[PDB]
Amino acid sequence: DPLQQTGQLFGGLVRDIRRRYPYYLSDITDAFSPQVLAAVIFIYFAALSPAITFGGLLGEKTRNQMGVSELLISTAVQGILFALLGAQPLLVVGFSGPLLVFEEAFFSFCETNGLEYIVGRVWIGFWLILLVVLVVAFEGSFLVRFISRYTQEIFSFLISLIFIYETFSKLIKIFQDHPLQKTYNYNVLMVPKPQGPLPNTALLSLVLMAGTFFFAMMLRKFKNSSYFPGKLRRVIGDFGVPISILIMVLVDFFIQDTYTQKLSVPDGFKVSNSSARGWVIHPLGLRSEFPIWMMFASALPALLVFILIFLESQITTLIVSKPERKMVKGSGFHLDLLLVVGMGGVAALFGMPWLSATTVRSVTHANALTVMGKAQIQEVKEQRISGLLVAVLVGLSILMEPILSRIPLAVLFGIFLYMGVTSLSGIQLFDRILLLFKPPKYHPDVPYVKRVKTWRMHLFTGIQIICLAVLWVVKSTPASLALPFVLILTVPLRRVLLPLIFRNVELQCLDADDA
Amino acid sequence: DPLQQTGQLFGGLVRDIRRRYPYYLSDITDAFSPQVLAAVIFIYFAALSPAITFGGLLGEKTRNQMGVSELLISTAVQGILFALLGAQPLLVVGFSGPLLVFEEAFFSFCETNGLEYIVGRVWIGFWLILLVVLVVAFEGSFLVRFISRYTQEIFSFLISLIFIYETFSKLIKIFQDHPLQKTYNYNVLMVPKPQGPLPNTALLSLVLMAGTFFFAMMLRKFKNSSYFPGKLRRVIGDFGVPISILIMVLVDFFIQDTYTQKLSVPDGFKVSNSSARGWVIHPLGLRSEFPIWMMFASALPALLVFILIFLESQITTLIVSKPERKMVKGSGFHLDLLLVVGMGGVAALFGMPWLSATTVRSVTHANALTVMGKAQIQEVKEQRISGLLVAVLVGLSILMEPILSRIPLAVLFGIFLYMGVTSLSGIQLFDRILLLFKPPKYHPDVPYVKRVKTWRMHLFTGIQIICLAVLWVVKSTPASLALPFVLILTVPLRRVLLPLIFRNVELQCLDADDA
């Protein structure tokens, strides 16, 4: 198994290298298939748009200390390294809401205490570099084995709901910014962006979203359909999202008059605010002499940042490398936790954000490479060039501004909704949530339906909604960085309370390692 | 069989009365089911909107000689009579494109020759009253037996394509009338209707259409799905279009600012133009003494009007009363042709327009009453109160203006697109057109796939497209009232050329009476 206690110091790192690197030729040569090129295109727009979204949200909140340029270079650099060195290349490394909430929370603290933020992270980085090596030394990444399906399901579901919620709030914002009014003022500037509201902007956006999501779902239906020859049907199905986007991007191109929000990158490869910082950030104070207490008190935030990246990256790896998916290569949790956290702490030195292995984009990347037949899984295309070319494109995103400038965010929102529903494909919790509305006569022929009672099977599914409810309440409240500690409290339940209120035969059936 | 030559004078009319009228108690008492009330609501909006559409088109073209008021009263009066007296009440009687093209063509002639149009039709009416009785006397409605599936298929398909084409051209017209412009003038009157173009009108219409059609198709998918209890799932599925409309009508109600075209009826039960005509039209000239040559030369148009109504109403009756549909009551072609044409010729006397039995609304009405199980057909709800209550509502359409005034045409266009695809459900031509794109390995297990060769089976399907192509070309060209003569030339092919180029075993399999 991958999470066995070796005992020998850095045995978990070495066995993960001894596991995957013998298959390094297959990790390059399995990327010649056309389904992989279709994944690169799909996952590029999946990887880029958050780097633009979170990039803008950071700058706005951190006064350009770290913005779109630093996140794009981080996401590009760490992505290329992790693509070439990672134990699971299908893990797409990038910046997340969890991290966004920390950066702004550390800034808000740094301004109050009179500390140079871009410097304060370089210390947090050194502790993340220290803590990860100390964990990887004692094979602490083994603890992944104790992360059960139950928690992986709650993690798989909660983030899928958030990614869907964020997508709609992104469309709702266009109706708030450009409401359906009887009259509109045309004496408004459009150089920075529309100052006041405009006609035809918000409904065309809705149409551009609804159109792309439609063309996405129909092409997913078409992929595993009976129409057209098998060779042409799979190619069209594999290039589903690329065709979905291309159509609805051309739709808006031929609408000359109507404005709608496009993709926005910086002018070139420059620091967001030259007055604030440089490329390389000095630990002992860039301007004002940095205090000695924060140089050692940065461990407390780093312990928090570690957990956020750990429980994000590792649970993502469990979900992406499940037995039910045909994962021939395997997975290395020790090397993945080392790289993701290690690169992040080093990235802080250059005033660029530390990243994690985000589930949706990682899941989406695997799902886009996962083949289907007859339906069941036959062979999941496992290689590095997919995860590499995504990071390379996110690096070149600033240089290829003329191509991105004609792509509406409305079109991208259609694909994020598709990614949201596509992520819920192989989640037994969602599949059990479906049985809540189905009558008991029509339930699927699965062990947890046959061997367990229906009224008890729904109570388990119900207790996971009690978790999701509490998990969603913590997300909204000020104490949002306490979510990892509430998510890791999920294990104690499945280990004590659930067994205490259930029969062992039911758990094994309900919560199984494989199907 | 229904179309047997009795020989005895009016034997075909009497046997159709002796057929159905013993089941007259079941023709009332099968309308207590909730699926029938759902059909009334659906088919009302299906029956009304064309009475508004074609009414406006007549008035516009005939200078209010016959407009929305006369078509609504005709469609109401003839509908109630035919609902109570008809051999097949599922036939929804109303005005069609075929008739629209005649009325405007007879007006265009009447103005040139200096003839009172509203008077000239009263003569055409007398010949329609004469010709139908002469046909029903010799059981001429028997000729229906010779109308093969091949022609019924071409008829079923061509009209379904037209009804879909007309629906989209109705949406395209909103984008022509309210284009996506950079600027809009708000110094425009809205009393008659918007004079110049407006913002948010065209895309909200598109959204209102796309929304209703979505909610229609998902509820049709939900109807024969596994979710929710069987008692509640069928009710929601049966009231599919009523719920689809209700949602998207409320959507637009809560949009205060944005204009979009609503349902428009006249003020009250009045003649469209009091200056032109009255209620009852005098045959020997209302104002100017009507010429004696037109009193007898009105037979030539009446012969044309007869054929248009005959080939519309009878082929509709064959399609609605096919063996594959569970039609327990049966059908009477002699009594249906008598009423539809007889009432029409009498309706001309009051300047009101003559109607036909239109296929889509008749098919839609049967399809809405046709139940599904497991899928296959179990029992088609055959009754009169459905066809009655539709005509009663179309009569009350002017009185219930405050309810219709809040219903957008955009919402109705969603339902006409649903009706368009719903009409193509049980058509072997469409089902064979699907096999054109399917590979030959995946073709359905049906006699005409098993017993006939695939390459020969597609050539038959291909020759029907050669017909549809020619049929569609005649529709566009000036000689549009020659379509019935090109449609009745379909029989000679299936009778001579097709058998000449095919093997008898193939025809029986391809062109079968039952499945």
Ligand SMILES: CCCCCCCCCCCCCCCCCC(=O)OC[C@H](COP(=O)([O-])OCC[N+](C)(C)C)OC(=O)CCCCCCCCCCCCCCCCC
């Ligand atoms: C199970 C399916 C149910 C879902 C239903 C809806 C599907 C999702 C939405 C539609 C798919 C994407 C199409 C986007 C087209 C954008 C139209 C537009 O505004 O731009 C062009 C233009 C916009 O104007 P314009 O400004 O570009 O005009 C160009 C010409 N100049 C510039 C000179 C004025 O619109 C049109 O011309 C009208 C076309 C409308 C598109 C037709 C769709 C009708 C909606 C009903 C249902 C649609 C399909 C149903 C799905 C299943 C199929 C059986």
Ligand SMILES: CCCCCCCCCCCCCCCCCC(=O)OC[C@H](COP(=O)([O-])OCC[N+](C)(C)C)OC(=O)CCCCCCCCCCCCCCCCC
């Ligand atoms: C089978 C797979 C594909 C089929 C579905 C194809 C996708 C598009 C379907 C077209 C119809 C849209 C849904 C029904 C009608 C609701 C829209 C409406 O009128 O309100 C929007 C309204 C109308 O615009 P509005 O904001 O002006 O509303 C009025 C409010 N004022 C005037 C005050 C500003 O906009 C919203 O508020 C947006 C919320 C809805 C977001 C929908 C985005 C489209 C994404 C697809 C959703 C539906 C498919 C999901 C299921 C299929 C597969 C899982």
Ligand SMILES: *[C@@H]1O[C@H](CO)[C@@H](O[C@@H]2O[C@H](CO)[C@@H](O)[C@H](O)[C@H]2NC(C)=O)[C@H](O)[C@H]1NC(C)=O
């Ligand atoms: C770029 O950095 C400069 C400082 O190097 C920022 O200037 C500060 O602005 C904040 C509020 O915006 C003030 O509270 C500080 O007093 C300013 N400090 C100095 C030294 O000017 C500036 O805001 C930053 N600009 C951007 C791009 O946000």
Ligand SMILES: *[C@@H]1O[C@H](CO)[C@@H](O[C@@H]2O[C@H](CO)[C@@H](O)[C@H](O)[C@H]2NC(C)=O)[C@H](O)[C@H]1NC(C)=O
């Ligand atoms: C109502 O009927 C009158 C009476 O025919 C119509 O008046 C005619 O108008 C047309 C052109 O619109 C002229 O060619 C005729 O010379 C007019 N005749 C008379 C006697 O006035 C009038 O157009 C009709 N109005 C409506 C509602 O269309």
Ligand SMILES: CC(C)CCC[C@@H](C)[C@H]1CC[C@H]2[C@@H]3CC=C4C[C@@H](O)CC[C@]4(C)[C@H]3CC[C@]12C
């Ligand atoms: C040295 C620290 C601060 C740098 C961070 C990376 C650490 C964890 C890396 C760098 C070099 C690595 C060592 C390189 C070689 C070997 C020999 C092998 O037979 C056992 C593992 C061992 C001993 C590795 C353990 C992990 C290691 C110490």
Ligand SMILES: CC(C)CCC[C@@H](C)[C@H]1CC[C@H]2[C@@H]3CC=C4C[C@@H](O)CC[C@]4(C)[C@H]3CC[C@]12C
């Ligand atoms: C312009 C932006 C918004 C969209 C970019 C999408 C582009 C790159 C996508 C959309 C459709 C794609 C094509 C779809 C199918 C095939 C056939 C395959 O045998 C080779 C690749 C090829 C030819 C793809 C190349 C990439 C492609 C052209």
Ligand SMILES: CC(C)CCC[C@@H](C)[C@H]1CC[C@H]2[C@@H]3CC=C4C[C@@H](O)CC[C@]4(C)[C@H]3CC[C@]12C
């Ligand atoms: C194809 C693979 C190997 C590379 C893809 C990403 C490349 C193009 C990106 C990633 C990070 C980028 C660098 C980031 C920062 C700087 C500093 C600036 O003062 C000059 C440009 C320079 C040096 C950039 C050049 C382009 C760069 C190297």
Ligand SMILES: CC(C)CCC[C@@H](C)[C@H]1CC[C@H]2[C@@H]3CC=C4C[C@@H](O)CC[C@]4(C)[C@H]3CC[C@]12C
């Ligand atoms: C915060 C909110 C949304 C919590 C929602 C939890 C819901 C879905 C849970 C809580 C209790 C659960 C119920 C507990 C017991 C039973 C009885 C059984 O015979 C059928 C299922 C049924 C009826 C469950 C269905 C799901 C249920 C209603």
Ligand SMILES: CC(C)CCC[C@@H](C)[C@H]1CC[C@H]2[C@@H]3CC=C4C[C@@H](O)CC[C@]4(C)[C@H]3CC[C@]12C
């Ligand atoms: C005015 C007449 C001549 C032409 C119009 C015929 C109309 C009114 C129809 C409708 C009802 C019909 C009658 C119904 C029943 C019968 C009984 C049958 O054993 C002989 C024919 C006879 C008597 C029919 C003759 C034609 C008839 C009278």
Ligand SMILES: CC(C)CCC[C@@H](C)[C@H]1CC[C@H]2[C@@H]3CC=C4C[C@@H](O)CC[C@]4(C)[C@H]3CC[C@]12C
């Ligand atoms: C206002 C316009 C646009 C829409 C009108 C549609 C109305 C009449 C439709 C929409 C949904 C329908 C309801 C749907 C389901 C049921 C349950 C059934 O057991 C009795 C009828 C009843 C209660 C229907 C009555 C009619 C209804 C309310």
Ligand SMILES: CC(C)CCC[C@@H](C)[C@H]1CC[C@H]2[C@@H]3CC=C4C[C@@H](O)CC[C@]4(C)[C@H]3CC[C@]12C
């Ligand atoms: C419920 C069933 C029986 C009837 C439904 C339709 C009714 C309401 C319609 C159909 C035709 C209509 C009539 C058509 C013409 C006129 C002439 C006008 O000068 C007064 C109203 C009057 C007399 C209408 C009254 C309402 C009416 C009788």
Ligand SMILES: CC(C)CCC[C@@H](C)[C@H]1CC[C@H]2[C@@H]3CC=C4C[C@@H](O)CC[C@]4(C)[C@H]3CC[C@]12C
């Ligand atoms: C005028 C335009 C619209 C063409 C209309 C007729 C078309 C659809 C017809 C004419 C001849 C037909 C082809 C005749 C023979 C074959 C060989 C068979 O193994 C597959 C179908 C195929 C390839 C047919 C497909 C449909 C076809 C191309």
Ligand SMILES: O=C(O)c1cccnc1Nc1cccc(C(F)(F)F)c1
């Ligand atoms: O989802 C948010 O907005 C959020 C914000 C702050 C902290 N945690 C958050 N949630 C969240 C989402 C995914 C993974 C994780 C986890 F890895 F830390 F467990 C947390």
Ligand SMILES: O=C(O)c1cccnc1Nc1cccc(C(F)(F)F)c1
């Ligand atoms: O559909 C048209 O545009 C049209 C116009 C004039 C005559 N005939 C037409 N077509 C048409 C449509 C359905 C049924 C019939 C028929 F019944 F007359 F055969 C004709």
